Amino acid sequence: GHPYYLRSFLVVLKTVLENEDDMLLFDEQEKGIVTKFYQLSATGQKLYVRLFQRKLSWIKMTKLEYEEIALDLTPVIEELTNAGFLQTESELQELSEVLELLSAPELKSLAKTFHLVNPNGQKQQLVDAFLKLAKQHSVCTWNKPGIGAVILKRAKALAGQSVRICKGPRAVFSRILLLFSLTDLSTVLLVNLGRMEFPSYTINRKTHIFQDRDDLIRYAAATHMLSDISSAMANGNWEEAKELAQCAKRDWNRLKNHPSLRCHEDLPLFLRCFTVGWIYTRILSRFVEILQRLHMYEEAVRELESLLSQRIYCPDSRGRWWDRLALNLHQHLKRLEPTIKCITEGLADPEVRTGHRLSLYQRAVRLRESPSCKKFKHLFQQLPEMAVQDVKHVTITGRLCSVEELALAHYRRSGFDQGIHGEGSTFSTLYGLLLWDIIFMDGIPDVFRNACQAFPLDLCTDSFFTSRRPALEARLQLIHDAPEESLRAWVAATWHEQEGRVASLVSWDRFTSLQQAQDLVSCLGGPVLSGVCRHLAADFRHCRGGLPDLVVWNSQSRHFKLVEVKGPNDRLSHKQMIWLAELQKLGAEVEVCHVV
Amino acid sequence: MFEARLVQGSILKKVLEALKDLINEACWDISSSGVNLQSMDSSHVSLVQLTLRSEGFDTYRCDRNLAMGVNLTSMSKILKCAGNEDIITLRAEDNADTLALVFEAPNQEKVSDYEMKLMDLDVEQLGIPEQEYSCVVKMPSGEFARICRDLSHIGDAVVISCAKDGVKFSASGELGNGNIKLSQTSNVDKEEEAVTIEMNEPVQLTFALRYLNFFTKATPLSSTVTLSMSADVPLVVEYKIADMGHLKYYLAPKI
Amino acid sequence: MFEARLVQGSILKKVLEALKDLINEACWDISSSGVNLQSMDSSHVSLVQLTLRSEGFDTYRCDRNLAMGVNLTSMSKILKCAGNEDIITLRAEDNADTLALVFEAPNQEKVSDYEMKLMIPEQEYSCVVKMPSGEFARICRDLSHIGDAVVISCVKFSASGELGNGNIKLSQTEAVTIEMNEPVQLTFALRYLNFFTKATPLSSTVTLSMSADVPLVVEYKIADMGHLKYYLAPK
Amino acid sequence: MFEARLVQGSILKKVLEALKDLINEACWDISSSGVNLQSMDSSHVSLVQLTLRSEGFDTYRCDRNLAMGVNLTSMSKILKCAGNEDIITLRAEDNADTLALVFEAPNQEKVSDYEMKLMDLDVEQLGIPEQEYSCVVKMPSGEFARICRDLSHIGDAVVISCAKDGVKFSASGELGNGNIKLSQTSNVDKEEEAVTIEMNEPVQLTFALRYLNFFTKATPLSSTVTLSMSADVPLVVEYKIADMGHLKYYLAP
DNA sequence: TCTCGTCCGCGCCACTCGTGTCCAGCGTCG
DNA sequence: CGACGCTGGACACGAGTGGCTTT
DNA sequence: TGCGGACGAGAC
Ligand SMILES: [Ca+2]
């Protein structure tokens, strides 16, 4: 059969082409390009997919080794060129590309030939010097042939054969990949996508995320520029990131008057997160991160204030920004009354939940007791009191195993034989096992688009508890008062019926065996599982993380202790504090193991 | 099918020491009056004109004009084979692209023969129409070469200004600044050390310095070097050769 | 204002060739006495002390003493642009950021100017050997070629290396003479010792001074008017 | 218990630096009386030998031979200090532990001493008996060095073409072919520059040029060199050492 | 010194290539 | 003949790209 | 966003 990369590419292409609503935005020429791709030999498709995953630049035919495709890949290259996907070195008519193609020794030799200022130097400075020399020095010198042409000819002759993926088909396939990745090539999906067996549901589509080809191209440009900004953050070139984000913000301001946007505001949130405006708001949040990194705290505050007035785009993160506007208003800049106003507005904001609601509140008390804000006697005006009950703390001394493994060994010595350490994945997996029938239920429109969708789009969005409220309430009330045998049967049936099916929640490698899952379910009981499943069903995005790490328990005594292990240089985040308090409310026994 | 014999063969070798760094390959025009090079550097900033008249070459006979482009570095490697005193003669076939160089010992006991690939390339034409140059300077070649090296020790550019007092080179770089001043001496004996300058116009003009270093490789050809320039014309650096030929380097303005 | 005209420019050339790699940056202290240079080497086991009076300079005027901190690489490269007989002039105004080197050949047909950007207890040594700089240079070079460390003994140089060992015994009668006041056997490194030998043309003979736990001193004397001393910390 | 002395200490230095690269980790098998060594090259294609007469040196210590396990790079390192006009004495310490080399200047005021631990030695002892060679030419060694150098610049394989009237070195490469013809000197002086020729039948055979360079590196030791060429057998190149020694190389194509 | 808050850097492994650094062979000029 | 100046080859790094699961 | 390192300020 086909290799893994080719398998993933064909699966993506087939899934996208099956999308009738998503096939319409592609131009007739782009559909012709796609159908030309299917008219290739297996070796041709393999080589094209192999070159697709590489960078978009000229690559020498010497550096093209692929034993899996063919020993001599020149006929495959010629077939691809005839098809129109690969342009050979004959089209390398740009000096800035051929110079980058040449290796460092070859570029040094070329610089020595042309009597450059610094023949022995960096490659980038060599390319810059070659461009500078090509700009002039030949217009009038005693015919008028451009020296740039001579440099290009010499560099092309030196580099030999070289191919590069064409702009058009590459862009078309990038947009196809983007359309596939809307519902979620990434490495996790580059390999094993042909063998992953997604869950079963009925595809139901009613609305169009994009209305025409121009909208999809705009969204692709926005997400590509967001990816460029993200790469700039990853590589640490924060000034380039700031420039790119400024250009993106000016583009967004230019585009804010587009009437097509007036349709995107009518999309549901879980579908509205796939629009150009959403991507530009995410880019503006990354711009806020850049400004905070580069210490324009006032400009970061202004950007956050502008963002916080846009209730249509990214409302779920409205907490992240409210908290940072408070921190960028009190810590980095010493404003105090505006910080109190920001805290009050954030606490009154319905979109701030869990940790980012606690953090603001903590800032609130940090301004209700500090002497610097004594004159501002308003933070006590309403300030809806939220209190997290303290949990037990146990200290451990020890020191080659991991910290969590050491804590697991400790609780093994203390009479808790069975113990697992998957943090959220232990509770998320259990919630998925218990509520697979409701998470992937039918009747909810616009949440199942493709067939390779590991999770309904309602997840990570409050609407998951709005569309399926009856069934979810019925299940969470049935689990609340249920015998251990019924819970065992439910978990066993879910595990048997759906074994190996990928899902965003259930991790089949978390439990070493089904018996461990059964024992954990029996020990946790009804109320604890009902509480955690309800808190994950309502606002899953803000309750996804911050869960305790180890679940340790004994089979005979049926005693468990959800333990959150903090290392010697660790601290309880607000999400973790909220989750520990919630588990304390549920009757579960929870404590913090501080390892020294 | 042409034959060219020369006694003081090292002279020819000296020529190969000068072109090799500047031009990797050049067109070797053949004529009854003399053999010309008429090539220019790769980077299109400098020209080299080499003329060896047939009068100096004993037993010179050429049937027709030939292009016979030559890889200069390869020819220098072949010419390194001989010594400083061997007599050198070159033979070119009627149509075969094989130039044969044979060198005979000064005592006529060691004879060496070699052949070259003699690659064929394009033969362009650069007019360099005769322009009347000004501020002609005649100075020893060694002084000029070491001045060029000293200035290249500092920066990557040079400026030359000629006035009634003399000639002045200058070079300013990031590391530092420097300049050379030479004054006309008018030696009575004229032991090739005169720095006599004729003055017609006080001009000043800028050039690159690496190409001056590549031009300085022709110093062993002769003691005297002639540098001429004007307001806008290219700099001309001429070395005579055994009263039979010349080698000229023209450099374009830096700006 | 300050001028210093030296006919023997080769002397300046070789003395700054000696300090080419010993020190990266150093200052040329100038007073009415002359030009003094007390420099801390890049390595942390050596010191440099160059002394020259004001008598040998054809012209000397020091209204205000100037540190004259010059990057030795840059000024050595500038000095490389002067001939052996090239008369060398050091100039620097009291409020000048740049130092000027004026090179004028004795034949006077040529004149050039360059501008560069300006930026131990005493104790008599128990033993001292005055021997030609060539001999000690060859000994140090060969014994560094055989090993990394050499011990000097009352003369004997013994180098220890991973490959093997070497031992050279000298004699006394361009002459070599030792006070033989005390016996010593003290080890020393070679890399800095090798660097201390680039001053072979700088002087005729070197007086290696050693004693009990006193730092090693090598001395190169200009034919007159000045001298140079390198101090090395014993191992 | 082995002692050798040479007033002209230079010749040993040139001999040792000549072999500093053509053989590494070589063997020294000097007998009780008479100095000799032989070793196959690092490429296992060519052989190098040298014979120095024991009575040619100044003195000798009456004892038995020992491995004298010598390594050239180490020796060269040690011998690099030795001058080209001083007296050199080689002394052997028992138990095959070290070898000492003492260099004393003629002025007897800057005397020196040296020594070095040796290394494990393996005896190969090829000992190929000599066979008669047809073509022989004696010519100055500097001429051979220049010829080898320029042919290495222009080619990769050297052709001998021994002949009665003279010799003709021929080769070729990507930059064309090269031929150099040396005629009989036929001068009354018969100096080292003069070349003599003795032929019985011409022999043509191509030889490698890199090892030819490695062997001509021994040019400064001898004023002249004798080349013996014969078909189907390695070329002989031979150097004379003050008529007190012979340094030979066998070059198999 | 101790405690709390805040910021900064993270796919993964191997394979090749850019890069500044160091050592040994080379032409030379007193 | 040798010491000095010049220069190219060899070398430990860190950065960048590429392949990751036809089993 | 979720992890782990680090440093900086208030109170000793
Ligand atoms: Ca943890």
Author numbering:
A (entry chain A): 371 to 512, 515 to 556, 571 to 785, 811 to 1007
B (entry chain E): 1 to 255
C (entry chain F): 1 to 119, 128 to 162, 167 to 185, 193 to 254
D (entry chain G): 1 to 253
Task: Quote the study's own text.
FAN1 (FANCD2-FANCI-associated nuclease 1) is a DNA structure-dependent nuclease ubiquitously expressed in the central nervous system and peripheral tissues that plays a role in resolving interstrand crosslinks at replication forks. It possesses both 5′ flap endonuclease and 5′-3′ exonuclease activities, allowing it to process DNA structures that arise during replication stress and repair pathways. FAN1 comprises a DNA-binding SAF-A/B, Acinus and PIAS (SAP) domain, a tetratricopeptide repeat (TPR) domain that mediates dimerization and protein-protein interactions, a virus-type replication-repair nuclease module (VRR) containing the catalytic site, and an unstructured N-terminal region. PCNA is a homotrimeric ring-shaped DNA clamp that encircles double-stranded DNA after being loaded by replication factor C (RFC).
To elucidate the impact of the HD-associated R507H mutation in FAN1, we generated a full-length recombinant FAN1 protein bearing the R507H mutation and reconstituted the ternary complex with PCNA and 5′ flap double-stranded DNA substrate. Although the overall conformation of FAN1 and the angle of the DNA substrate remained unchanged between the FAN1–PCNA–DNA and FAN1 R507H–PCNA–DNA complexes, notable conformational alterations were observed in PCNA. Specifically, the R507H mutation resulted in an increased distance of 16.5 Å between H507 of FAN1 and D232 of PCNA. This shift may allow for the observed interaction between H485 of FAN1 and Y211 of PCNA, a residue previously shown to play a critical role in modulating PCNA function. In the mutant FAN1 R507H–PCNA–DNA complex, H507 of FAN1 remains distant from D232 of PCNA (right). Furthermore, when the FAN1 R507 residue was mutated to H507, the interaction between PCNA D232 and FAN1 H507 was disrupted as evident by the increase in distance between these residues in FAN1 R507H–PCNA–DNA complex. Structural comparisons between the FAN1–PCNA–DNA and FAN1 R507H–PCNA–DNA complexes reveal a slight shift in the alignment between PCNA and FAN1, suggesting a compensatory effect at the PCNA-FAN1 interface. This shift facilitates an interaction between H485 of FAN1 and Y211 of PCNA.
